[PDB]
Short mmCIF file of C-alpha atoms and ligand atoms in Angstrom, two decimals:
data_model
loop_
_atom_site.label_atom_id
_atom_site.label_comp_id
_atom_site.label_asym_id
_atom_site.label_seq_id
_atom_site.Cartn_x
_atom_site.Cartn_y
_atom_site.Cartn_z
CA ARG A 1 -4.00 32.04 3.81
CA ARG A 2 -3.70 28.27 4.18
CA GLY A 3 -4.08 26.39 7.46
CA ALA A 4 -1.25 24.41 9.06
CA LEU A 5 -0.95 20.62 9.11
CA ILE A 6 0.08 19.68 12.63
CA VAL A 7 0.69 16.06 13.59
CA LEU A 8 0.94 14.55 17.07
CA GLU A 9 3.04 11.37 17.40
CA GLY A 10 4.39 9.24 20.22
CA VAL A 11 4.19 5.72 21.61
CA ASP A 12 0.94 4.30 23.02
CA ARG A 13 -0.37 6.21 26.04
CA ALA A 14 1.84 9.23 25.53
CA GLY A 15 -1.20 11.53 25.57
CA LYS A 16 -1.72 12.06 21.83
CA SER A 17 -5.52 11.94 21.79
CA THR A 18 -6.01 14.02 24.92
CA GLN A 19 -3.56 16.64 23.57
CA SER A 20 -5.04 16.65 20.06
CA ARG A 21 -8.56 17.28 21.41
CA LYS A 22 -7.35 20.04 23.76
CA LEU A 23 -5.31 21.70 21.01
CA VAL A 24 -8.23 22.00 18.59
CA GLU A 25 -10.40 23.39 21.41
CA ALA A 26 -7.80 26.02 22.41
CA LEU A 27 -7.08 27.04 18.82
CA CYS A 28 -10.80 27.55 18.06
CA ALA A 29 -11.26 29.45 21.33
CA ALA A 30 -8.45 31.76 20.10
CA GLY A 31 -10.34 32.48 16.89
CA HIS A 32 -8.55 29.97 14.62
CA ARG A 33 -10.45 27.68 12.27
CA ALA A 34 -9.10 24.26 13.37
CA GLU A 35 -10.32 20.70 13.12
CA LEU A 36 -9.27 17.30 14.42
CA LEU A 37 -8.33 14.24 12.27
CA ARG A 38 -6.93 10.89 13.45
CA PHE A 39 -5.27 7.79 11.96
CA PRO A 40 -6.36 5.18 11.65
CA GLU A 41 -9.69 6.72 10.64
CA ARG A 42 -11.95 3.80 11.41
CA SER A 43 -15.13 5.09 9.81
CA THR A 44 -14.21 4.03 6.25
CA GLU A 45 -14.30 0.54 4.75
CA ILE A 46 -10.52 0.38 5.09
CA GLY A 47 -10.67 1.78 8.59
CA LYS A 48 -13.15 -0.94 9.57
CA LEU A 49 -10.74 -3.71 8.51
CA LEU A 50 -7.99 -1.95 10.47
CA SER A 51 -10.14 -1.69 13.59
CA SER A 52 -10.98 -5.39 13.42
CA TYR A 53 -7.29 -6.21 13.05
CA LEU A 54 -6.20 -4.01 15.95
CA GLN A 55 -8.86 -5.61 18.19
CA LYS A 56 -7.72 -9.05 17.06
CA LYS A 57 -11.14 -9.89 15.68
CA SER A 58 -9.16 -10.62 12.54
CA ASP A 59 -5.69 -11.47 11.30
CA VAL A 60 -4.09 -9.71 8.36
CA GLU A 61 -0.75 -10.44 6.73
CA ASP A 62 1.83 -7.84 7.88
CA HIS A 63 2.60 -6.30 4.50
CA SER A 64 -1.11 -6.10 3.63
CA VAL A 65 -2.04 -4.35 6.92
CA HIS A 66 0.86 -1.85 6.49
CA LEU A 67 -0.55 -0.93 3.05
CA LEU A 68 -4.12 -0.62 4.35
CA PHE A 69 -2.88 1.82 7.05
CA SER A 70 -1.31 3.99 4.32
CA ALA A 71 -4.29 3.68 2.00
CA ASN A 72 -6.39 4.93 4.93
CA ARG A 73 -4.33 8.13 4.92
CA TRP A 74 -4.46 8.59 1.13
CA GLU A 75 -8.24 8.29 1.11
CA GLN A 76 -8.31 11.45 3.32
CA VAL A 77 -5.86 13.46 1.15
CA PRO A 78 -8.48 15.26 -0.96
CA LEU A 79 -10.20 16.39 2.28
CA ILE A 80 -6.94 17.44 3.92
CA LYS A 81 -5.87 19.53 0.91
CA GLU A 82 -9.31 21.09 0.64
CA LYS A 83 -9.42 22.04 4.31
CA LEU A 84 -5.90 23.49 4.43
CA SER A 85 -6.52 25.50 1.24
CA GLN A 86 -9.62 26.98 2.91
CA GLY A 87 -7.53 28.24 5.83
CA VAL A 88 -8.50 25.45 8.28
CA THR A 89 -5.65 24.17 10.45
CA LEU A 90 -5.69 20.40 10.89
CA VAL A 91 -4.57 18.71 14.09
CA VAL A 92 -3.81 15.04 13.39
CA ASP A 93 -3.60 12.29 15.98
CA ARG A 94 -0.99 9.94 14.51
CA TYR A 95 0.11 9.94 10.86
CA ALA A 96 2.60 8.18 8.57
CA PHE A 97 5.33 8.15 11.26
CA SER A 98 3.24 5.78 13.41
CA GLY A 99 2.70 3.72 10.25
CA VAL A 100 6.46 3.28 9.73
CA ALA A 101 7.32 2.87 13.38
CA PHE A 102 4.79 0.14 14.07
CA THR A 103 5.48 -2.04 11.00
CA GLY A 104 9.22 -1.26 11.18
CA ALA A 105 9.12 -2.72 14.68
CA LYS A 106 8.36 -6.17 13.21
CA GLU A 107 11.13 -8.48 12.03
CA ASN A 108 12.30 -8.20 8.43
CA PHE A 109 10.68 -4.84 7.63
CA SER A 110 13.17 -2.19 6.49
CA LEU A 111 12.36 1.44 7.32
CA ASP A 112 12.83 2.16 3.60
CA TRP A 113 10.11 -0.30 2.50
CA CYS A 114 7.82 0.94 5.28
CA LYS A 115 8.13 4.60 4.22
CA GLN A 116 7.35 4.14 0.51
CA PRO A 117 3.54 3.90 0.47
CA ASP A 118 3.31 7.24 2.32
CA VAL A 119 5.83 9.07 0.10
CA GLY A 120 4.05 12.08 -1.38
CA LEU A 121 1.42 12.52 1.35
CA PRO A 122 0.75 16.11 2.49
CA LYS A 123 3.84 17.09 4.54
CA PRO A 124 3.12 18.22 8.11
CA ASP A 125 4.23 21.74 8.90
CA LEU A 126 4.92 20.64 12.50
CA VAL A 127 5.38 17.14 13.97
CA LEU A 128 5.06 17.09 17.75
CA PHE A 129 6.62 14.03 19.43
CA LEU A 130 5.22 13.40 22.94
CA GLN A 131 8.22 11.97 24.76
CA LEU A 132 7.58 9.87 27.86
CA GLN A 133 9.39 6.97 29.53
CA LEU A 134 7.84 3.66 28.44
CA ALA A 135 7.69 3.00 32.16
CA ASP A 136 5.81 6.22 32.93
CA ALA A 137 3.46 5.41 30.00
CA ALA A 138 2.60 2.10 31.62
CA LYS A 139 2.05 3.85 34.96
CA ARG A 140 -0.80 5.44 33.03
CA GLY A 141 -3.23 2.86 34.27
CA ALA A 142 -2.46 -0.28 32.30
CA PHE A 143 -2.29 -1.91 28.91
CA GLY A 144 -5.41 -2.32 26.82
CA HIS A 145 -6.08 -5.55 24.96
CA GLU A 146 -5.24 -4.22 21.49
CA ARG A 147 -2.52 -5.49 19.17
CA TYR A 148 0.99 -4.16 19.88
CA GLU A 149 0.13 -3.17 23.47
CA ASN A 150 3.17 -4.81 25.04
CA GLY A 151 6.47 -3.42 26.31
CA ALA A 152 8.88 -5.21 24.00
CA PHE A 153 7.08 -4.12 20.86
CA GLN A 154 6.67 -0.54 22.15
CA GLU A 155 10.42 -0.32 22.73
CA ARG A 156 11.08 -1.37 19.13
CA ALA A 157 8.55 1.14 17.81
CA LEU A 158 10.24 3.89 19.84
CA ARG A 159 13.58 3.02 18.26
CA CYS A 160 12.01 3.41 14.81
CA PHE A 161 10.51 6.75 15.84
CA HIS A 162 14.03 7.96 16.77
CA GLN A 163 15.32 6.93 13.33
CA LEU A 164 12.61 9.01 11.61
CA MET A 165 13.55 12.00 13.72
CA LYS A 166 16.94 12.16 12.03
CA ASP A 167 15.04 13.41 8.99
CA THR A 168 15.66 17.13 9.08
CA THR A 169 13.36 17.81 6.14
CA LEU A 170 10.64 17.72 8.83
CA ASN A 171 9.88 20.25 11.59
CA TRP A 172 10.03 17.89 14.55
CA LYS A 173 9.46 19.30 18.03
CA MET A 174 10.02 17.21 21.15
CA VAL A 175 7.46 17.59 23.93
CA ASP A 176 7.91 16.48 27.53
CA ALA A 177 4.74 14.43 27.85
CA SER A 178 5.48 13.39 31.45
CA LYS A 179 4.13 16.71 32.78
CA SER A 180 0.51 17.43 33.74
CA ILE A 181 -2.20 17.45 31.05
CA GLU A 182 -2.43 21.23 31.32
CA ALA A 183 1.34 21.82 31.28
CA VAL A 184 1.89 19.61 28.27
CA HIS A 185 -1.07 21.34 26.58
CA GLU A 186 0.37 24.78 27.06
CA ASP A 187 3.72 23.67 25.55
CA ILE A 188 1.95 22.17 22.54
CA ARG A 189 -0.35 25.18 22.12
CA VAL A 190 2.49 27.71 21.93
CA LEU A 191 4.44 25.56 19.46
CA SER A 192 1.24 25.23 17.40
CA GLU A 193 0.43 28.98 17.29
CA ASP A 194 3.94 29.60 15.92
CA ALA A 195 3.58 27.03 13.16
CA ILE A 196 0.16 28.31 12.10
CA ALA A 197 1.59 31.76 11.69
CA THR A 198 5.04 31.20 10.28
CA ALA A 199 5.31 27.63 8.98
CA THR A 200 2.49 28.36 6.52
CA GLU A 201 4.13 31.17 4.48
CA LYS A 202 5.36 28.36 2.19
CA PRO A 203 3.14 25.99 0.16
CA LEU A 204 2.10 22.63 1.55
CA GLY A 205 4.95 20.18 0.98
CA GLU A 206 5.14 16.53 0.07
CA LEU A 207 6.29 13.96 2.60
CA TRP A 208 9.59 12.10 2.10
CA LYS A 209 9.88 13.56 -1.37
CA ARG B 1 11.33 -29.96 -5.58
CA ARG B 2 9.52 -26.61 -5.59
CA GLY B 3 6.91 -25.58 -8.14
CA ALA B 4 7.38 -22.67 -10.54
CA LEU B 5 5.69 -19.27 -10.25
CA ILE B 6 4.52 -18.37 -13.74
CA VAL B 7 2.77 -15.08 -14.42
CA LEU B 8 0.73 -14.07 -17.47
CA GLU B 9 0.59 -10.34 -18.27
CA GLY B 10 -0.65 -8.18 -21.13
CA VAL B 11 -3.15 -5.42 -21.86
CA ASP B 12 -6.91 -5.99 -21.58
CA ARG B 13 -8.23 -8.65 -23.96
CA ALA B 14 -4.84 -10.08 -24.80
CA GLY B 15 -6.01 -13.57 -23.83
CA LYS B 16 -4.54 -13.84 -20.31
CA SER B 17 -7.46 -15.62 -18.65
CA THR B 18 -8.12 -18.03 -21.50
CA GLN B 19 -4.39 -18.90 -21.66
CA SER B 20 -4.02 -19.22 -17.88
CA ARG B 21 -6.94 -21.68 -17.67
CA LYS B 22 -5.64 -23.73 -20.62
CA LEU B 23 -2.11 -23.80 -19.22
CA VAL B 24 -3.14 -25.22 -15.85
CA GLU B 25 -5.29 -27.84 -17.62
CA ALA B 26 -2.43 -28.92 -19.93
CA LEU B 27 0.14 -29.01 -17.14
CA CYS B 28 -2.09 -31.21 -14.95
CA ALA B 29 -2.87 -33.46 -17.92
CA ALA B 30 0.91 -33.90 -18.28
CA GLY B 31 1.21 -35.07 -14.68
CA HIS B 32 2.28 -31.75 -13.10
CA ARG B 33 0.69 -30.45 -9.91
CA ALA B 34 -0.45 -26.97 -11.06
CA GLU B 35 -3.05 -24.49 -9.89
CA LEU B 36 -4.51 -21.21 -11.10
CA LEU B 37 -4.40 -17.85 -9.20
CA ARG B 38 -5.52 -14.42 -10.45
CA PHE B 39 -5.18 -10.75 -9.44
CA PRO B 40 -7.17 -9.02 -8.39
CA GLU B 41 -8.49 -11.88 -6.25
CA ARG B 42 -11.98 -10.59 -5.63
CA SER B 43 -13.06 -13.09 -3.00
CA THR B 44 -11.39 -11.30 -0.07
CA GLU B 45 -12.57 -8.16 1.73
CA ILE B 46 -9.93 -6.18 -0.15
CA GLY B 47 -10.82 -7.88 -3.40
CA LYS B 48 -14.47 -6.90 -2.90
CA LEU B 49 -13.58 -3.19 -2.65
CA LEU B 50 -11.46 -3.57 -5.78
CA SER B 51 -14.27 -5.24 -7.70
CA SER B 52 -16.68 -2.46 -6.74
CA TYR B 53 -14.14 0.13 -7.88
CA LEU B 54 -13.46 -1.57 -11.21
CA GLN B 55 -17.21 -1.79 -11.89
CA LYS B 56 -17.58 1.87 -10.95
CA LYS B 57 -20.00 1.05 -8.16
CA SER B 58 -17.53 3.04 -6.09
CA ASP B 59 -14.81 5.65 -6.35
CA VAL B 60 -11.48 5.29 -4.60
CA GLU B 61 -8.63 7.78 -4.46
CA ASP B 62 -5.86 6.70 -6.90
CA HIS B 63 -3.08 6.16 -4.38
CA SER B 64 -5.42 4.25 -2.05
CA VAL B 65 -6.64 1.89 -4.83
CA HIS B 66 -3.03 1.24 -5.96
CA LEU B 67 -2.18 0.16 -2.39
CA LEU B 68 -5.27 -2.05 -2.08
CA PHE B 69 -4.26 -3.85 -5.32
CA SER B 70 -0.83 -4.60 -3.81
CA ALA B 71 -2.26 -5.54 -0.42
CA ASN B 72 -4.46 -8.01 -2.31
CA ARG B 73 -1.31 -9.73 -3.56
CA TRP B 74 0.43 -9.73 -0.16
CA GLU B 75 -2.57 -11.36 1.50
CA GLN B 76 -1.98 -14.37 -0.83
CA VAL B 77 1.79 -14.61 -0.17
CA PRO B 78 1.60 -17.21 2.62
CA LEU B 79 -0.51 -19.43 0.31
CA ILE B 80 1.78 -18.90 -2.68
CA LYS B 81 4.91 -19.81 -0.68
CA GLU B 82 3.19 -22.82 0.83
CA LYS B 83 2.04 -24.13 -2.52
CA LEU B 84 5.37 -23.64 -4.30
CA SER B 85 7.26 -25.29 -1.42
CA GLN B 86 4.94 -28.31 -1.77
CA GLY B 87 5.91 -28.69 -5.44
CA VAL B 88 2.75 -27.08 -6.89
CA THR B 89 3.35 -24.83 -9.90
CA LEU B 90 1.25 -21.66 -9.82
CA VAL B 91 -0.11 -20.04 -12.96
CA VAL B 92 -1.06 -16.43 -12.21
CA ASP B 93 -3.37 -14.27 -14.30
CA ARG B 94 -1.95 -10.77 -13.80
CA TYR B 95 0.44 -9.79 -10.99
CA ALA B 96 2.41 -6.76 -9.78
CA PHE B 97 3.32 -5.69 -13.34
CA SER B 98 -0.35 -4.96 -14.10
CA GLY B 99 -0.45 -3.08 -10.80
CA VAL B 100 2.40 -0.77 -11.87
CA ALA B 101 1.29 -0.42 -15.46
CA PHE B 102 -2.27 0.57 -14.68
CA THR B 103 -1.54 3.16 -11.95
CA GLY B 104 1.60 4.33 -13.79
CA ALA B 105 -0.68 5.11 -16.71
CA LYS B 106 -2.36 7.87 -14.66
CA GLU B 107 -0.91 11.38 -14.50
CA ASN B 108 1.64 12.15 -11.80
CA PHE B 109 2.43 8.57 -10.80
CA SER B 110 6.11 7.66 -11.14
CA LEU B 111 6.96 4.05 -11.99
CA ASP B 112 9.25 4.11 -8.93
CA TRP B 113 6.43 5.00 -6.50
CA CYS B 114 4.14 2.45 -8.17
CA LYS B 115 6.65 -0.40 -7.79
CA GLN B 116 7.40 0.05 -4.07
CA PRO B 117 4.42 -1.64 -2.40
CA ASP B 118 5.13 -4.84 -4.36
CA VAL B 119 8.88 -4.89 -3.65
CA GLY B 120 9.67 -8.19 -1.93
CA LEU B 121 6.74 -10.20 -3.33
CA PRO B 122 7.54 -13.75 -4.49
CA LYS B 123 9.49 -13.31 -7.76
CA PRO B 124 8.00 -15.06 -10.79
CA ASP B 125 10.26 -17.63 -12.40
CA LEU B 126 8.71 -16.77 -15.79
CA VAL B 127 6.69 -13.72 -16.88
CA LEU B 128 4.82 -14.29 -20.14
CA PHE B 129 3.76 -11.08 -21.94
CA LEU B 130 0.90 -11.66 -24.42
CA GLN B 131 1.69 -9.16 -27.15
CA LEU B 132 -1.16 -8.05 -29.41
CA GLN B 133 -1.95 -4.86 -31.32
CA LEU B 134 -4.30 -2.66 -29.30
CA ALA B 135 -6.33 -2.61 -32.49
CA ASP B 136 -6.47 -6.41 -32.77
CA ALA B 137 -7.41 -6.53 -29.05
CA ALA B 138 -10.40 -4.31 -29.74
CA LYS B 139 -11.35 -6.49 -32.71
CA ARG B 140 -11.90 -9.04 -29.97
CA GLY B 141 -15.55 -8.19 -29.74
CA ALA B 142 -15.69 -4.87 -27.91
CA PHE B 143 -14.94 -2.98 -24.75
CA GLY B 144 -16.62 -3.93 -21.51
CA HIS B 145 -17.95 -1.27 -19.16
CA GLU B 146 -15.18 -1.58 -16.56
CA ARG B 147 -12.77 1.15 -15.48
CA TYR B 148 -9.76 1.67 -17.77
CA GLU B 149 -11.43 -0.04 -20.74
CA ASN B 150 -10.62 2.70 -23.24
CA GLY B 151 -7.97 3.00 -25.95
CA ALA B 152 -6.06 6.01 -24.68
CA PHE B 153 -5.55 4.55 -21.23
CA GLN B 154 -4.62 1.12 -22.65
CA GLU B 155 -1.92 2.73 -24.78
CA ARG B 156 -0.42 4.39 -21.71
CA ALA B 157 -0.52 1.14 -19.75
CA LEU B 158 1.28 -0.63 -22.62
CA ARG B 159 4.03 1.98 -22.51
CA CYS B 160 4.51 1.28 -18.80
CA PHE B 161 4.60 -2.46 -19.49
CA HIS B 162 7.47 -1.86 -21.96
CA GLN B 163 9.39 0.08 -19.30
CA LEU B 164 9.11 -2.85 -16.85
CA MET B 165 10.41 -5.20 -19.51
CA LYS B 166 13.77 -3.44 -19.45
CA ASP B 167 14.24 -5.10 -16.06
CA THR B 168 16.54 -7.99 -16.85
CA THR B 169 16.38 -9.37 -13.32
CA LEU B 170 13.13 -10.98 -14.57
CA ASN B 171 12.65 -13.86 -17.03
CA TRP B 172 10.34 -12.11 -19.47
CA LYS B 173 9.13 -14.02 -22.52
CA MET B 174 7.19 -12.33 -25.30
CA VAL B 175 4.26 -14.27 -26.76
CA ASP B 176 2.52 -13.52 -30.05
CA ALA B 177 -1.03 -13.38 -28.75
CA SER B 178 -2.51 -12.55 -32.17
CA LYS B 179 -2.45 -16.23 -33.18
CA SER B 180 -5.23 -18.77 -32.60
CA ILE B 181 -6.13 -19.82 -29.04
CA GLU B 182 -4.53 -23.20 -29.64
CA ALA B 183 -1.37 -21.83 -31.27
CA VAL B 184 -0.78 -19.30 -28.53
CA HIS B 185 -1.44 -22.05 -25.98
CA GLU B 186 1.15 -24.35 -27.43
CA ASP B 187 3.78 -21.54 -27.36
CA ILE B 188 2.97 -20.77 -23.72
CA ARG B 189 2.91 -24.45 -22.73
CA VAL B 190 6.40 -25.19 -24.08
CA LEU B 191 7.85 -22.07 -22.42
CA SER B 192 6.14 -23.13 -19.18
CA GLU B 193 7.44 -26.75 -19.19
CA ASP B 194 10.98 -25.36 -19.53
CA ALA B 195 10.60 -23.01 -16.58
CA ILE B 196 9.10 -25.68 -14.34
CA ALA B 197 12.08 -27.88 -14.99
CA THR B 198 15.00 -25.51 -15.11
CA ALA B 199 13.98 -22.15 -13.64
CA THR B 200 13.25 -23.89 -10.32
CA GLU B 201 16.76 -25.24 -9.52
CA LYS B 202 17.27 -21.94 -7.65
CA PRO B 203 15.27 -20.77 -4.60
CA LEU B 204 12.21 -18.57 -5.01
CA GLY B 205 13.39 -14.98 -5.41
CA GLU B 206 12.10 -11.64 -4.23
CA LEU B 207 10.61 -9.17 -6.68
CA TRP B 208 12.39 -5.86 -7.41
CA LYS B 209 14.81 -6.56 -4.59
N1 ANP C 301 -0.08 14.29 30.97
C1 ANP C 301 -0.74 13.22 31.47
N2 ANP C 301 -0.53 12.77 32.71
C2 ANP C 301 -1.21 11.72 33.19
N3 ANP C 301 -2.12 10.98 32.58
C3 ANP C 301 -2.33 11.44 31.32
C4 ANP C 301 -1.72 12.50 30.72
N4 ANP C 301 -2.18 12.68 29.43
C5 ANP C 301 -3.08 11.73 29.29
N5 ANP C 301 -3.21 10.93 30.40
C6 ANP C 301 -4.12 9.78 30.60
O1 ANP C 301 -3.50 8.60 30.07
C7 ANP C 301 -4.44 7.84 29.30
C8 ANP C 301 -3.96 7.80 27.87
O2 ANP C 301 -4.17 9.14 27.28
P1 ANP C 301 -4.45 9.30 25.73
O3 ANP C 301 -4.48 10.77 25.42
O4 ANP C 301 -5.62 8.52 25.31
O5 ANP C 301 -3.09 8.70 25.14
P2 ANP C 301 -2.79 8.24 23.64
O6 ANP C 301 -1.42 8.64 23.50
O7 ANP C 301 -3.73 8.68 22.62
N6 ANP C 301 -2.89 6.53 23.71
P3 ANP C 301 -3.00 5.60 22.34
O8 ANP C 301 -4.15 5.92 21.52
O9 ANP C 301 -3.23 4.23 22.97
O10 ANP C 301 -1.68 5.67 21.65
C9 ANP C 301 -5.78 8.54 29.52
O11 ANP C 301 -6.46 7.99 30.71
C10 ANP C 301 -5.43 9.96 29.81
O12 ANP C 301 -6.39 10.64 30.66
N1 ANP C 302 -6.07 -16.03 -29.48
C1 ANP C 302 -7.32 -15.50 -29.52
N2 ANP C 302 -7.90 -15.17 -30.68
C2 ANP C 302 -9.14 -14.66 -30.69
N3 ANP C 302 -9.94 -14.41 -29.66
C3 ANP C 302 -9.34 -14.75 -28.50
C4 ANP C 302 -8.09 -15.29 -28.35
N4 ANP C 302 -7.80 -15.51 -27.02
C5 ANP C 302 -8.90 -15.13 -26.40
N5 ANP C 302 -9.87 -14.65 -27.24
C6 ANP C 302 -11.22 -14.13 -26.90
O1 ANP C 302 -11.11 -12.74 -26.54
C7 ANP C 302 -11.87 -12.47 -25.37
C8 ANP C 302 -10.92 -12.02 -24.27
O2 ANP C 302 -10.16 -13.21 -23.82
P1 ANP C 302 -9.64 -13.30 -22.33
O3 ANP C 302 -8.79 -14.54 -22.22
O4 ANP C 302 -10.73 -13.16 -21.36
O5 ANP C 302 -8.66 -12.03 -22.30
P2 ANP C 302 -8.03 -11.30 -21.03
O6 ANP C 302 -6.73 -10.95 -21.53
O7 ANP C 302 -8.08 -12.03 -19.77
N6 ANP C 302 -8.99 -9.90 -20.84
P3 ANP C 302 -8.95 -8.99 -19.46
O8 ANP C 302 -9.31 -9.74 -18.27
O9 ANP C 302 -10.07 -8.01 -19.76
O10 ANP C 302 -7.62 -8.32 -19.40
C9 ANP C 302 -12.63 -13.76 -25.07
O11 ANP C 302 -13.92 -13.78 -25.78
C10 ANP C 302 -11.78 -14.84 -25.65
O12 ANP C 302 -12.53 -16.01 -26.09
C1 NYM C 303 -1.76 5.35 12.07
C2 NYM C 303 -1.26 3.97 12.52
C3 NYM C 303 -1.41 3.38 13.71
N1 NYM C 303 -0.88 2.15 13.95
C4 NYM C 303 -1.18 1.52 15.29
C5 NYM C 303 -0.70 2.33 16.51
C6 NYM C 303 -1.76 2.08 17.58
N2 NYM C 303 -1.25 0.90 18.41
C7 NYM C 303 -2.91 1.49 16.77
C8 NYM C 303 -4.25 2.19 17.17
O1 NYM C 303 -3.87 3.58 17.41
P1 NYM C 303 -4.73 4.60 18.32
O2 NYM C 303 -5.25 4.06 19.62
O3 NYM C 303 -3.99 5.85 18.17
O4 NYM C 303 -6.14 4.39 17.49
O5 NYM C 303 -2.53 1.58 15.40
C9 NYM C 303 -0.21 1.36 12.98
O6 NYM C 303 0.21 0.24 13.28
N3 NYM C 303 -0.03 1.95 11.77
C10 NYM C 303 -0.53 3.22 11.45
O7 NYM C 303 -0.32 3.62 10.20
C1 NYM C 304 -3.78 -6.92 -10.73
C2 NYM C 304 -4.29 -5.54 -11.18
C3 NYM C 304 -5.20 -5.25 -12.12
N1 NYM C 304 -5.51 -3.96 -12.41
C4 NYM C 304 -6.62 -3.74 -13.41
C5 NYM C 304 -6.37 -4.34 -14.81
C6 NYM C 304 -7.75 -4.77 -15.29
N2 NYM C 304 -8.30 -3.61 -16.11
C7 NYM C 304 -8.57 -4.75 -14.00
C8 NYM C 304 -9.40 -6.07 -13.87
O1 NYM C 304 -8.53 -7.10 -14.42
P1 NYM C 304 -9.05 -8.51 -15.00
O2 NYM C 304 -10.26 -8.46 -15.87
O3 NYM C 304 -7.80 -9.20 -15.32
O4 NYM C 304 -9.87 -8.94 -13.62
O5 NYM C 304 -7.66 -4.47 -12.94
C9 NYM C 304 -4.99 -2.83 -11.72
O6 NYM C 304 -5.35 -1.70 -12.04
N3 NYM C 304 -4.05 -3.10 -10.79
C10 NYM C 304 -3.66 -4.41 -10.44
O7 NYM C 304 -2.76 -4.50 -9.45
MG1 MG C 305 -4.97 7.82 21.34
MG1 MG C 306 -8.91 -11.76 -17.99
MG1 MG C 307 13.52 3.84 -3.26
#
């Protein structure tokens, strides 16, 4: 019985990392085999270049960094397929949607061109989108010093996210991320239990293909 | 007056590097401003990963290495556009065609998926293809120990090359690379002088777009 591939997406500070950690903990406490993955995955050679870029320790041409983000997902595909075939559910903090939304937010980058590198990746069985007002997300303390952490850019990324949601080949679920950590968690948990059960009766699909 | 973007392609051992070096030398001796570029460009962080892969000092998932090859071209785009706008002709030893032919030679890689990352790159004004029998290319000493240096794979890459040649948006010129170094050089040189002159009256295009 394969595991489910569940992705958490949203703008910066929507609660993705807190909710991904809490989900894996709750699923394992409920007897599921579940593990956490995140993108970018900074531990690889590619991920190190991406971390340096995000921290502005380095500058990378926009097309080149978009491709490195996608390559960073493909390098984990063998692992992802192996885990899911063993019955392990994978909870993923950001995936190809973030890749398209962030580059697509820059001038002169079509959503079409941004999607291509990720075409064929393992298709998530469930894509949770943690919806929150950009304003309420900024009330969450304050902006960090990483690339893209500014209001204007976040608003353009959000717009791109909404375009990808029109894709009904994907099981998108909206989450009200403005609620308490525990309330948001319970919403996410119940959606996730359903996917693990029922979304997996079919073979793992291929994204945007 | 912009410079021309001339690319040399062909299978391994077709003479690309010898002919690219000789072309730049002859063009500069004839008063042109011309410089040599090559792909992969191993001097960058990306290029170092690619060199390690090619030498089999490392293994990289096939989709991920295809994207790193393309990223390695995009990281040079600002330089390429700057040089060409200054009137410098650029002679390039391998480009996106090699990228598509080599990955497209592997199982389960569509030419369409392989082309996407490079869509939008600076479009070559002239693409020279150094045609030589795979057999005569092997009579050129012997195979090196790098990845892909085997007959079966070379034959599949050649097939992919022939598919890309059906693209009439590109100024492809076949060269008989079985001739002497000097004879092949003179053919390439005269084709190149013509492109520099006449192919550049129009703005630099965008590849596969
Ligand atoms: N529901 C919530 N209500 C209030 N604060 C929250 C909530 N969820 C998370 N936070 C806090 O907001 C901050 C950002 O949470 P985090 O889970 O790291 O968001 P994120 O979406 O992963 N951010 P990023 O990696 O920058 O896109 C942390 O201090 C969290 O403790
Ligand atoms: N026209 C030619 N006739 C005979 N030998 C040649 C010719 N051109 C090049 N060579 C020799 O063949 C070898 C390969 O030439 P080279 O120019 O490096 O090919 P290449 O196409 O760049 N190979 P690769 O980088 O592996 O794809 C070298 O020893 C050259 O001296
Ligand atoms: C997966 C991914 C993330 N990001 C951006 C979004 C975030 N601002 C940044 C770091 O994310 P996080 O803090 O979740 O590590 O990385 C991209 O620009 N492209 C991608 O493909
Ligand atoms: C530009 C490029 C080259 N190659 C392969 C073709 C060659 N066997 C190898 C090294 O080339 P060379 O010896 O020209 O450095 O690299 C690829 O597989 N993809 C690419 O995008
Ligand atoms: Mg986070
Ligand atoms: Mg060579
Ligand atoms: Mg397409």
